[PDB]
Symmetry: D2
Subunit: 103 residues, 4 copies
């Protein structure tokens, strides 16, 4: 029901091994994981657990850029939303964009 | 070797049935098709045909928004690039962003 | 030292009268209110802070996208933006935070200048 | 009537001294040169055209991202942006075309005002 994908706009590649945390407004931690070699993170939650509510997806972009040797602006990339969801984040050192696609 | 994906940032959905044309700088038409129900367009070209060069991917966003009843700003969304490539476009009535991911 | 600019990708306009709240991370890792305001007719919010108030730390800029969309009769997926960054760590800088809004997406960038 | 603004998402700065070419679609469906210039220290390009020269039609704004990246020692995937739109069809408007640049991506939006 929820998938996160992270792309790197500087190197033109998936953003691999990026930590992603999901919170639900009571911020109860709700789910988390690290992106795969495809930049995707599957298996966050289950239908039973993902109820309507306000969620935040916080992507640890700072650790990502720091491991590449690039100084980043933001602490994170994110989307706070009211609730299949795909959340995608496109990363640059001084910018991000985040979208949701609900199918 | 080349895939195009188109997303709609207003309705939060894949952009379905969108015409996509690819050109190669001699603009020789090179490939084209329409996005599927997933917003994706597979099968554009072949390894043998997709040689290094300058390519333009032009997405007919105007026809897309007009069929939805929304007045759009642009004639198209696009990326002109020097050359697996995935080109993704995120559409709004007055904006687009386009990225490439090369894996 | 801190300017916020907000654009509307649905209407092709500045995002006018959008509420913007800035917070600073406190010692106890809570967010303490720092400064707030509304965008002007040009989409810009000037005068949030001063050089004397703008210390180093972790700042959060929250843009109230929900109210903006709702008031325009648009469905926001987006509750609010939360733009979070370390400021002034290596000395005073000027920051412009820009945000481009759509109902299911936003883009944000920073312009950092050394004054 | 036509302004272009360009930002750099790699460096967190305006994109300065970027070449911008504007073309207008001719009757034979070729692109005819219309106006061109370079961005300033603020990333802005003012003075492209005048109200008397800016007629209705299909315009293409090409931003030379390749040269900008190369000169900064960055690999551009991006050869150039091609931002294409119908202007002035229902009467004269003022347009701001903004572009946010990264090596493998760009975002663009329009601000349209009725003067
Ligand atoms: O959504 C995807 O599957 C995707 C695949 C390749 C490149 C970008 C992608 N997403 C997207 C593109 C532009 C802005 C924000 C997100
Ligand atoms: O339009 C501006 O004046 C502006 C100023 C500073 C930073 C970004 C800007 N616009 C913009 C923001 C995100 C995506 C595309 C365009
Ligand atoms: Ca409900
Ligand atoms: Ca070669
Ligand atoms: Ca310090
Ligand atoms: Ca007309």
């Amino acid at each position: 029901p929820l998938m996160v994908k992270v792309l790197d706009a500087v190197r033109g590649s998936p953003a691999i091994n990026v930590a992603v945390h999901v919170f639900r407004k009571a911020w109860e931690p709700f789910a988390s994981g690290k992106t795969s070699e495809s930049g995707e993170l599957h298996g966050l939650t289950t239908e039973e657990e993902f109820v309507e509510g306000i969620y935040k997806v916080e992507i640890d972009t700072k650790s990502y850029w720091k491991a590449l040797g690039i100084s980043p602006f933001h602490e994170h990339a994110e989307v706070v939303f009211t609730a299949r969801y795909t959340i995608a984040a496109l990363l640059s050192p001084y910018s991000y964009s985040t979208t949701a696609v609900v199918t």
